[PDB]
């Protein structure tokens, strides 16, 4: 009935810079509140009744607005402020939540550190073989991973998982798992994980050779 538009949807701010995010309503609302949500946590009550700060909210935060357009401001962006921010209106008998604003901490470019892990003897016993590649502490978030088995590309059985922005480092991490059978693993010798990122012209390659033993 009442639509809330949060803008920008995805934003970035550097450390110590002033950030303003907005929440606008399709019609007049009785009240508006803000909530912060991080990675594996319940939403935290942040700003209530347009400008009141909830229990342990830092003084750098402020809420403003009336009628239809509302704002959330961070005077000095801190690393720990990297989160999703949700606005919510109340107009009896309805409660509506905006789609959220993802706020990222803008940091310096950083090349990923690649590590490659061969399958466990424990897993091999089971007749399974997962080859794991970790790509750590990179910025910006955008990355492309490729797997090669005996110099040729492998697409199927690849599981990718991206981390959350670290809020001490302001970096991202990624995991890429190639799962094969023990028979399929033992049929090939070289395993390679290659990452394409803006910080390098060429791919960041990490490989291992399984032979003899």
């Amino acid at each position: 009935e009442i639509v809330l538009t949060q803008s920008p949807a995805i934003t970035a701010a550097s450390l110590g810079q002033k950030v303003t995010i907005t929440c606008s309503a399709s019609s007049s609302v009785s009240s508006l509140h803000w909530y912060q949500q991080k990675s594996g946590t319940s939403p935290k009550p942040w700003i209530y009744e347009i400008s009141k700060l909830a229990s342990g909210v830092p003084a750098r935060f402020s809420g403003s607005g009336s009628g239809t357009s509302y704002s959330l401001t961070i005077n000095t962006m801190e690393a720990e402020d990297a989160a999703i921010y949700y606005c919510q209106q109340w107009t009896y008998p309805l409660i509506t939540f905006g789609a959220g604003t993802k706020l990222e901490l803008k940091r310096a470019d950083a090349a990923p550190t690649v590590s490659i892990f061969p399958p466990s003897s424990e897993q091999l016993t089971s007749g399974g073989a997962s080859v794991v590649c970790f790509l750590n502490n990179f910025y910006p978030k955008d990355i492309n991973v490729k797997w090669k088995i005996d110099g040729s590309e492998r697409q199927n059985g690849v599981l990718n998982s991206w981390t959350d922005q670290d809020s001490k480092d302001s970096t991202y991490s990624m995991s890429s798992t190639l799962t094969l059978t023990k028979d399929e693993y033992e049929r090939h010798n070289s395993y390679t994980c290659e990452a394409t990122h803006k910080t390098s012209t060429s791919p960041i390659v990490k490989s291992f050779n399984r032979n003899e033993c």
Partner: protein
């Protein structure tokens, strides 16, 4: 102090029905308006509805009016949610919250997960991630592969060592083809902190199940 604890979540068959409960303590439950909120994996917050302290007025999100029934006891200090013809689409964390004036969710529970699937439950198998002497070092990277489990639930992963230069990275679960999840946990520490012959324990807790422990070697 105020506490809200949801229970009743878990695996439910598509087209099934379940009742969720939210136990409230540390406040006089009977005086407050209570609500339910849901969040599908990777999606935003969606209001289900609210209940008046003395059960007379129940307000819902118009679209959801047709599959959810909010109720409360007051004696039992419990809030309930009945979900009737559950779709895969209904898979989400369900949160109960205590409402304040101006429709603010002042206190929230930790949420209970509802997984609408036909696929059977499966416990994870934990495997060590260690590299041979001639493959890495300084810093040392070790890990625990938490493999082929369902449903996703809540995974608690703790390591035997902690410090200033010891970093833990818990990778969010990834769903394979079969319909089984895998996660990995990684520990980065200075080589001096994880010498050859030594090990670090990874402690995994899937939902309310007993902890599964693995001793991971610093070097292969």
């Amino acid at each position: 102090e105020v506490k809200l604890l949801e229970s009743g979540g878990g695996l439910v068959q598509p087209g099934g029905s379940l009742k969720l409960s939210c136990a409230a303590s540390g406040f006089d439950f009977s005086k407050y308006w209570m609500s339910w909120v849901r969040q599908a994996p990777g999606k935003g917050l969606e209001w289900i509805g609210e209940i008046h302290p003395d059960s007379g007025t129940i307000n819902y999100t118009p679209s959801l009016k047709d599959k959810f029934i909010i109720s409360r006891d007051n004696a039992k200090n419990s809030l309930y949610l009945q979900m009737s013809k559950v779709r895969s689409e209904d898979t989400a964390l369900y949160y109960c919250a205590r409402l304040h004036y101006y429709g603010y969710n002042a206190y929230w529970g930790q949420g209970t997960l509802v997984t609408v699937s036909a696929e059977s439950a499966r416990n994870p198998t934990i495997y060590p991630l260690t590299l041979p002497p001639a493959l890495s070092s300084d810093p040392v990277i070790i890990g625990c592969l938490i493999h082929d489990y369902f449903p996703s639930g809540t995974m608690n992963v703790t390591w035997g060592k902690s410090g200033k230069d010891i970093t833990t990275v818990n990778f969010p679960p990834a769903l394979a083809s079969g319909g089984r999840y895998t996660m990995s946990n990684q520990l980065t520490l200075p080589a001096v902190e994880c010498p050859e012959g030594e090990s670090v324990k990874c402690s995994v807790q899937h939902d309310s199940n007993p902890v599964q422990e693995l001793d991971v070697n610093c070097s292969g």
